[PDB]
Amino acid sequence: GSHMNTTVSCELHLRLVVSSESSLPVPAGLRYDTADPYAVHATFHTGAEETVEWVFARDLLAEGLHRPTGTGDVRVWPSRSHGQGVVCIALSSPEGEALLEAPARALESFLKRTDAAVPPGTEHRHF
Amino acid sequence: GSHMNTTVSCELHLRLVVSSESSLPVPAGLRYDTADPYAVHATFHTGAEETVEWVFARDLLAEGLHRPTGTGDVRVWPSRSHGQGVVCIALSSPEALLEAPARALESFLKRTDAAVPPGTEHRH
Amino acid sequence: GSHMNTTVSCELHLRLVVSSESSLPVPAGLRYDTADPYAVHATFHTGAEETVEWVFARDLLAEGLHRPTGTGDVRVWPSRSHGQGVVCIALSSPEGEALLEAPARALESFLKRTDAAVPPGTEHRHF
């Protein structure tokens, strides 16, 4: 008998930025697992019975609330839209390039709950 | 940051063929994961708080829409029942006969093919 | 195609024993997988969008209905509280020490369903 994992989750409503004047709604689930303490797992509901799963560095999403960050597949930066603070998530794959807007307040509140489970700087205690 | 997986799923109502006289309803989930691109995962809801999980070759379900196929644990073949096309799924472990509605099965496989065309699985 | 797994599950209501006179409700999901025939997986719903996952030896929970058992992370023993038979579950991790009360009848009824799927003594047939 042993403690395998603690999970912190939330549901966010993201916007897929199609154009300057057009966006599509993308419900997303975020999960944090204390057994994988550097990571955040994201499920993007891109269709009724379709999902796309991405893994992010928790520290990249945390930094993305305050300043532009990331190289390679993922670029993150803060901004505002429709009178809300947002985190912009630019994703590159073999398939192509997508731009998503996450509500900053909801993202930050989820990261604060992950910090209560595993304070940043203590991830190594779990490995 | 990295793309771990794309999932395509559907919910089917299958018929457990108990006998010629009587059959039972089995709600099932099918899921295709591009991280496991040769496979289809099936969850058979056999009881209120009970499931049976099977893994199939995608290509076996795809072939089963058109002709009889499989040896060992799984045999699949097309047929008709109550005026609908069905795929018959015979499963052996240490035996169950299931009927899947062909249209719904085929439309799920076509969505998996749009994500990963058969023949390209190895690119993933 | 291969028959990966058969799952037997139940939802129980456990009491987290905070104090002599104070307890908190912990909804818990128990899952038995015939592909992992020695184990019971427990999900403790400790808040709206947080869970704590534990693995137990099925045989430890089974023994815990009848007598005190376990060394290390998990200690289990039968008892009574508010006139109902309970199994006491004491859990230790680097993170936490917890005392939980499970209703004995409901726990036993779940284990009997796992025994109908994989009778104790036959776990090895699955490997």
Q: Which of C53, C60, C35, C3 is nearest to C123 (CA)?
A: C35
- Token pair for residue C45? 């719903």
> B77: alpha, beta or left, given left = phi > 0 and alpha = psi -120 to 50?
beta
Amino acid at C40: V
CA atoms of A68 and A87, how far apart (whole Å)? 9
* Measured CA angle at C58 (ends C55, C63), to 5 deg: 125
- Asked if C123 contacts C35 with a C-beta cutoff of 8 angstroms, the reply is no
Domain annotation covers residue B49 = yes
Amino acid at C92: S
Alpha-helix residue ranges (DSSP H) falling in chain A: 58-64, 104-117, 123-126
Provide the Cα torsion C91, C96, C99, C102; round to 10°.
-60
Token pair of A114, please? 């992950």
Using DSSP's 3-state secondary structure scheme, residue C96 falls into: coil
Residue spans of alpha helices (H) in chain C: 58-64, 104-117
3-state secondary structure of C27: strand
Q: Which helix (H) or strand (E) holds A39?
A: strand A39-47
The position carrying tokens 């998996």 is B112
B110 lies in some domain = yes
Yes or no: say if A28 and A11 are a contact pair by the CB < 8 Å rule. Answer: yes
Among candidate residues A27, A48, A23, the one with its CA nearest the CA of residue B7:
A48
Q: Which two tokens stand for residue A40?
A: 């955040």
In order of A22, B15, C65, C99, the CA distances from C96 in angstroms are 48, 47, 24, 10
Record the resolution, in angstroms: 2.3
SS3 A47: strand
Q: Under an 8 A CB cutoff, do B3 and A72 touch?
A: no
HSE-up (13 A, CA, CB side) for residue B26? 25
- Alpha-carbon gap, residue C88 to C25, rounded angstroms: 14
Q: A50, A39 in Cβ contact below 8 A?
A: no
Contact C50, C32 (CB under 8 A): no
In a domain, C126, yes or no: no
B62 lies in some domain: yes
Nearest to C50 among A2, A3, A7 (CB): A7
Bridging pattern class, strands A74-81 and B84-91? unpaired
CA gap A42, A46 in Å, rounded: 12
Residue type at A87? Answer: V
Beta bridge partners of B60: none
What is the distance in angstroms between the CA of the first residue and the CA of the last residue of chain C? 19
Choose among C74, C63, B2: nearest CA to A55.
B2
Q: What residue in A sits closest to B116 (Cα-Cα)? A: A95
Separation of CA B60 from chain center: 9
- Is the Cβ–Cβ distance between A12 and A25 less than 8 Å? no
Q: Please report, to the nearest 10 degrees, the dihedral formed by the alpha carbons of residues B33, B34, B38, B43 taken in order.
A: 10
The answer to whether residue A2 sits within a structural domain is no
Distances (CA, A) of A54 to A39, A43, A51, A89, A127: 10, 7, 10, 12, 21
d(CA C111, CA C30): 10
What chain B residue is nearest to C117 in terms of C-alpha separation?
Answer: B50
Residues of B in contact with A60 (CB under 8 A): 1
Q: What is the DSSP string of C44-98?
A: EEEETTEEEEEEEEHHHHHHHTTS-B--TTEEEEEEEETTEEEEEEEEE-SS-EE
> Which structural domain, as residue segments, surrounds residue B91?
7-115
Cα separation, B71 vs B57, whole angstroms = 12
- For residue B91, the domain's CATH number is 2.30.31.20
Angle formed at CA B78 by CA B77 and CA B81, multiple of 5 degrees: 125
Beta-strand pair B2-16/B24-33:
antiparallel
SS3 at position C112: helix
Q: B53: which residues sit within 8 A by CB, 6+ positions away? A: B41, B42, B43, B44, C3, C4, C5, C6, C7
How far is Cα C37 from Cα B120, in angstroms, rounded to an integer?
36
Identify the burial level of A33 via C-beta atoms within 10 angstroms of its C-beta, where 0-12 means exposed, 13-18 middle and 19 or more buried: buried
Task: Assign C21 to helix, strand or coil.
Answer: coil
Residue with tokens 């859990």: C91
Chains near A with 3+ CB pairs less than 8 A apart are B, C
Experimental approach: X-ray
Asked if C49 and A8 come within 8 Å (Cβ–Cβ), the reply is: yes
In angstroms, the first-to-last Cα distance of chain B is 17
CB C8 within 8 A of CB C32: yes
Hey, of A5, A6, A30, which one would you mutate to test binding to chain C, going by the most C CBs within 10 A of its CB?
A6
Structure tokens of A59?
């520290």
Give the number of domains in chain C. Answer: 1
Q: How many helices (DSSP H) and strands (DSSP E) are in chain C?
A: 2, 7
CA distance C29 to C110: 11
Q: Which residues contact B43 (CB under 8 A, 6 or more apart)?
A: B28, B29, B31, B51, B52, B53
Tokens of B113: 């093919």
Q: Is residue B121 part of a domain?
A: no
Asked if B27 and B13 count as a contact pair (C-beta separation under 8 A), the reply is yes
Question: Can you tell me the distance from the alpha carbon of A22 to that of B59, in angstroms, rounded to the nearest whole number?
Answer: 39
Contact B7 A51 (CB under 8 A): yes
Write the CB contacts of C101 (distance below 8 Å, at least 6 apart in sequence): C14, C15, C17, C23, C79, C81, C86, C87, C88, C89
